[PDB]
Structure formats: C-alpha cells, structure tokens
Amino acid sequence: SLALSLTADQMVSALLDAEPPILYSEYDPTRPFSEASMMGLLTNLADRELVHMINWAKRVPGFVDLTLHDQVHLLECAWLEILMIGLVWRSMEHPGKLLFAPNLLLDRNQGKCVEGMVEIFDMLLATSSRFRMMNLQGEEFVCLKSIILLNSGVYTFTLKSLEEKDHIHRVLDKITDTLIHLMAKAGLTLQQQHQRLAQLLLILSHIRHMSNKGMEHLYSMKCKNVVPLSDLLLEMLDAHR
Amino acid sequence: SLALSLTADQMVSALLDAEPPILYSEYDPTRPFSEASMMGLLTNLADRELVHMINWAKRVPGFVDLTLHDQVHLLECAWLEILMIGLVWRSMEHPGKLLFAPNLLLDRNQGKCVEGMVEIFDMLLATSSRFRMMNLQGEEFVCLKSIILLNSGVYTFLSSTLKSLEEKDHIHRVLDKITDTLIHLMAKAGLTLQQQHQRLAQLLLILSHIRHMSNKGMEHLYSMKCKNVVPLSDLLLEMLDAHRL
Amino acid sequence: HKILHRLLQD
Amino acid sequence: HKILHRLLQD
Ligand SMILES: Cc1cc(O)ccc1[C@H]1CC[C@@]2(C)[C@H](CC[C@@H]2O)C1
Ligand SMILES: Cc1cc(O)ccc1[C@H]1CC[C@@]2(C)[C@H](CC[C@@H]2O)C1
C-alpha cells in the first residue's frame, strides 16, 4: 500500500533514488592473476555489493510490506540475478568488457583464468550487447531490476500467504504500468510499446539462466576450496540447495 | 520472410494446427511404483514427446527459415522448457496433480517415489496453479510455447558473420509477431489497454520460472543418469548432453 | 551427426 | 545465524 498509490513518475524517481553505489575492487596489479585470486576479487566484491543490495531492496516500493520471511526468500532467490543485471548495465558502454568495478574491467580472455567461468562471461557479455542494441534506458533498467527482485522467488512461496503473493503481483503490475508509461513518453508507438515490453521481459529469462549457471559455478569453486566465501555469501549460495 | 506477413488470427490458427498430440504412458496401473519404474515411465514419455516436438517446431512460423544449426541450438536449449510448459498446461484443471498423460496423473506425494524429484513437482504444480488462476487460454498457451522455442536459445547464438546476425534479427521479428498475437487475443477478450500490458507482463515473467525449472530439471535428470537409476534413450542423452552439465 | 540433426531433416 | 535476516532488520 502506498506503492500502489504511486504514479509512474513517483515510481521511477523512487527507484532511481534507491540505486546502490558503484563499488571498487580490491584489485592489486602488483601480483599476477590466478584462478584463486580472481575468484577472491569477484566474490569479495559480490559480498560487499550484497550489503548494499539488501538496503536497496528495502527501498523498493512494497518490499517492506512483506513479512521478513518473504523478504529473505526473495533476496535469496534473486541476489545473483540482481548482481548480474547491474553488471551488464555497467558494462553497456564497454563492448567486449565486463565492468565489475571502475578498477576492474575484464574481457572474456581474462575470464579464462578461472575454470568454467568464461562461459558465464560470454553470456553476460551477450546480455550487455543486447541491452546496448536495444538502447536500454536507466529508468527501464531500475524497473527491470525491481521486477527481478519481486518475481524470481514469488512462485516458490498456502495460507495468506496468498495475500503476500497478491500484493507482490499488484506491485509488479504497477511497474509494468511504469515501463509502458516510460515508453509512451519516449515517443514509442502503442505497438512498439508492447513489443519492447516483451523484449525486455524475455531477457529476464536469460538472466535467470545465467544465475542458475553462475550458482552452480560458484558452488563448484566452493566445493574445491578454490576460494573462501564470506558467511553471508555461503548462506545465499546455500539457499539454492 | 512468409511468417512476417501472417495476421494475428493466422498466427493463432497456425500454432493451433501445429499442436502435437497428447501421448499415453505405457503405465500398467495394476503395479505400484518403484524409483526405477517411475523414472522409466517419465523418461520413456519424454523421449516420445521429443520426436513430436521436433516436428512441431518445424511447423512454428519462421522456424524452418533458420539454418539447420540454429534450429538445433534452439531445440537443445529449450526442449525441457517446452515439455514442462506442456505439462503444466495439461495439468491446469487438475489441482495438485501433474497430468504427464491421460493414464498417468501423478500427485505431489508420488514425486517422492524418486529421489529429489518432489521439489521439481512442487515447482511445476505452482506453475499450473498460477496458470489456473490467470485463467490461461489455449491460444495464449500456444503463443507462450513458441516464444520459449525462439527466445530461450537466441542469446547464446555466436554473433559475427552476416548470416548469424540475420538469424537473430529474424528470430526477434517473429518474436514481435507473436507478441502482437498475444496482445490481439487479449484485446479480443475485451481487456483494456492497461490490462493487456499487465497480462502480457504476467505471462512472460512466468517463462523466467519455467527456465528455472528447466535448469533444475536438467541437473536432476543428469544426476539420475549418472546414478544409473534409469537407462536413457540416445536422443534424450544428446539433448541432455547439449547442456553439458 | 547427432540424432536431433537427422530428425530435423526427416 | 542468519546474516541476511539480521541485515534486513538493521
Ligand atoms: C556477475 C557478478 C556481478 C558482480 O557485481 C559481482 C560478481 C559477479 C559474479 C562473478 C563470477 C562468479 C565469481 C560469481 C557467479 C559465478 C562466478 O563464480 C559472481
Ligand atoms: C516435465 C516433463 C514433462 C513431460 O511431458 C515429460 C517428462 C517431464 C520430466 C519428468 C521429470 C524428470 C524425469 C525429467 C526432468 C526432471 C526429472 O528427471 C522430465
């Protein structure tokens, strides 16, 4: 409630204001990259981004309306998707590169340093290329990221409960209204509007895919003692198994 | 070309006509289930459905316009998603049950008959409940399934080369047509402009969970294969081996 | 060639 | 412990 009262413009500004900062890596270029060290950098970064994500989620209209139990489930389910969509957004203006941080800009060949990671880099890069081709806007991005937060875990929640799901879907609908409203303002025809809406939402399917693969990769790195994961990271990873 | 000229009504009837048949299980209802016997039934079914899926895919407008290689990629990536959305659709009017076949209607507890499968049943059932509450229509279903075929694997196409970029753009053109079709169906149902957009978004976001179920199912099927619980067909094995995990 | 390859032609 | 649970409260 109140989130359902928000106008399209209010929804946008709220999400824009909630945006988390861009963090720096602890990358030291005095030592050469190893599979272990690169995994260390990336997971260290992810861990610090998580803390900001959690606080970002609280500023997403309607999120704090949910039970603490449902908030946990949503973030547990969507955290890697959210990290990924932010990554591809940061990397849009860097063709062939992934901007994990202003001081950490990696190409696919650097992904080869870690076993099985380049396949994930390739997928992320293709997603970044797709966004670039669609000329994705900042306002559209923040809408997509909030959709991922609310949608990814909603299907895996009976009691009421049934009310938690309905509230989530109401807010999702409001963001749909917001996206369309944004496209209309941008001058897109009515037809172009629902076509672009579909294009953007279908990309979330590939982002889900990347998350699933990334979770399996991160898990295998853990099970081989390649990198020591933070307690928070271990718990987020544990939620998917 | 060709598929891009189709009208909204022509797209619907084309998809409806292309629909594969509902196969039966060999299940002998007189004998109780074992872990092995149920996996055998389910995988035997999937194997036979795959043969029909391949011929259905060729009847999806624009699909045969793609190179043989690209058709392969799309099916390899989307096969389990396509099986799953079919399952949830068949099970829509059977709350708490998964209608794998008219003679194989399983409830959630029978998913426990196989190690780790009940969690996958739960996800499929929740998807069927969501479809049921949205009152998903047959014409909408066929649109969603074709979208999965064309969309799921398009992002992993190797770009570069003229032919490849031409393939991706053809796929997206056709995808736009199906979107036009979905909207047409909703406008025809009397939904307002705002309702159409909301419903479209609702339908497409479900495909993200369907992708999730496929990824999980693939891992489970792979685990079953390795533990040698069930002998998988050569076809099923190659489709599973395309996900290389 | 794989089985899928063959079925897509036939 | 549940760090996520706690972080959400803080
Ligand atoms: C995508 C992403 C975005 C970030 O802002 C930070 C980190 C990551 C990834 C980087 C690659 C991984 C270390 C894991 C997932 C799969 C790999 O193990 C996290
Ligand atoms: C979803 C589905 C739909 C069908 O029309 C047939 C089969 C299946 C599943 C049934 C469960 C499994 C045997 C695998 C995937 C995960 C399990 O191993 C295939």
3-state secondary structure of A187: coil
Distance CA(A86)–CA(B14), nearest Å, equals 39
Tokens of B138: 């047959």
What HEC string does B42-104 produce?
A: HHHHHHHHHHHHHHHHCCCCCHHHCCHHHHHHHHHHHHHHHHHHHHHHHCCCCCCEEEEECCE
Distance of CA B126 to the CA centre of its chain: 16
CATH class label, B1-245? mainly alpha
Mutate to test the pocket of ligand 1, among A24, A44, A83 (most ligand atoms within 8 A of CB): A83
Q: Is B43 in the pocket of ligand 2 (CB under 6 A)?
A: yes
For ligand 2, mutation pick of B43, B209, B229 (most atoms within 8 Å of CB): B43
Residues of chain D in contact with residue A51, where contact means CB-CB under 8 angstroms, are 7
| Nearest by Cα to B78 from B19, B156, B4 | B156
Best A155, A163, A196, A240 member to test B by mutation, with max B CBs in 10 Å, is A155
In chain A, what residues touch D6 (CB-CB under 8 Å)? Answer: none
In order of A24, A84, A224, B149, the CA distances from A227 in angstroms are: 19, 20, 8, 37
Alpha-carbon distance values, A223 to A46, A66, A238, A240 (Å): 18, 34, 12, 15
Closest ligand 2 atom to residue B217 Cα is 16
Neighbours of chain C (3+ CB pairs under 8 A): B
CA distance linking residue A10 with residue A157, whole number of Å: 29
Segment holding B146, helix H or strand E = helix B138-151
Residue B55: partners with Cβ closer than 8 Å, 6 or more residues away: B20, C7
Cα maximum dimension of chain C: 14
Dist. CA A42 → ligand 1 center (Å): 6
The b-or-e profile of B124-147 (16+ CB within 10 A means b, else e) is bbbbbbbbeeeebeebbbbbbbbb
Residue A199 distance to chain B (closest CA, Å): 8
C-alpha A169/C-alpha B139 separation (Å) is: 23
Task: Find the residue in B nearest to A122 (Cα).
Answer: B156
Q: Taking a C-beta distance cutoff of 8 angstroms, is the pair B69, B99 a contact?
A: no
For residues B245 and A139, give the distance between their C-alpha atoms in angstroms, rounded to a whole number.
36
User: How far is C-alpha B74 from the geometric centre of its chain's CA atoms?
Assistant: 12
Here the tokens at position B20 are 């594969």
Residue B77 CA to residue B154 CA, distance in Å, equals 9
Q: What does this entry list as its resolution, in Å? A: 2.2
Ligand 2 pocket check for B111: Cβ under 6 Å? no
Helix, coil or strand: residue A105? strand
Strands B97-101 and B104-107: antiparallel
Give the nearest partner residue to B198 out of A176, A190, A205, using CB atoms.
A176
How many angstroms separate the CA atoms of B109 and B104, rounded? 14
Question: What is each CA distance from B81 to B51, B52, B118, in whole angstroms?
Answer: 15, 15, 18
In 3D space, the residue among A93, A189, B5, B188 whose CA is nearest the CA of residue A197 turns out to be A189
> Phi-psi bin for A225: left (phi > 0), alpha (psi -120 to 50), beta?
left
Q: Would you state the CATH architecture of domain A1-241?
A: Orthogonal Bundle (1.10)
Give the H/E segment covering residue B139. helix B138-151
Domain boundaries of chain A, sorted by first residue: 1-241
- Please give the biggest Cα pair distance in chain B: 58
The whole-angstrom separation of Cα A128 and Cα A93 is 9
How is residue A98 annotated by DSSP? E
How many residues does this entry show for chain D? 10
Ligand 2 pocket member B81 (CB < 6 A): no
Query: Three-class SS of residue A97?
Result: strand
Q: Is B28 in contact with B44 (CB distance < 8 Å)?
A: no
Give the sign of the dihedral formed by CA B80, CA B82, CA B88, CA B93: negative
Helices (H), A65-223: 68-90, 108-111, 118-134, 138-151, 162-185, 190-223
Q: Which amino acid is at B8?
A: A
Cis link prior to A205 (omega < 30° from 0)? no
CA distance D9 to chain A (A): 8
Residue B16's contacts (CB-CB under 8 Å, 6 or more residues apart) are: B138, B139, B142
Question: Which of A48, A51, A54 is the best residue to mutate to test the D interface, defined by the most D CB atoms within 10 Å of its own CB?
Answer: A54
Contact A124, A210 (CB under 8 A): yes
CB atoms closer than 10 angstroms to residue B217: 18
| Interface with B, mutate which of A85, A146, A209 (most B CBs under 10 A) | A209
Tokens of B202: 């609702």
Ligand nearest A42 Cα, by number? 1
Residue type, B179: T
* Cβ neighbours of residue A39 closer than 8 Å, sequence gap 6 or more: A114, A221, A226, A227
Residue A99 in contact with residue A105, Cβ under 8 Å?
Answer: yes
Amino acid at B161: T
Residues 6+ apart with CB under 8 A from B182: A198, B140, B143, B144, B200, B203
Q: Are A131 and A88 in contact (CB under 8 A)?
A: yes
- Token pair for residue B137? 């229509």
Dihedral pair phi/psi, residue B107, rounded to 5° = -95, 170
Experimental technique: X-ray
CA atoms within 13 Å, Cβ hemisphere of B16 = 11
Judging contacts by C-beta atoms under 8 Å, the chain B residues touching residue A133 are: none
The residue whose C-alpha atom lies closest to atom 1 belonging to ligand 2 is B84
Output the CA–CA distances (angstroms, integers) from residue B42 to A72, B84, B114, B122, in the order listed: 34, 12, 11, 16
Cα–Cα distances (Å) from D2 to A232, A234, A238, in that order, read: 8, 11, 11
User: How many A from CA of C7 to the centre of ligand 2?
Assistant: 21
Sign of CA dihedral A129, A135, A138, A141: negative
Token digits for A108? 């696919």
- For residue A109, give both structure tokens: 């060949």
Degrees, nearest 5: CA angle B193-B199-B205: 140
Closest Cα to atom 16 of ligand 2:
B217
Closest to A121 measured CA to CA, from A137, A131, A109, A135:
A109
Question: Do at least 3 CB pairs under 8 Å connect C with B?
Answer: yes
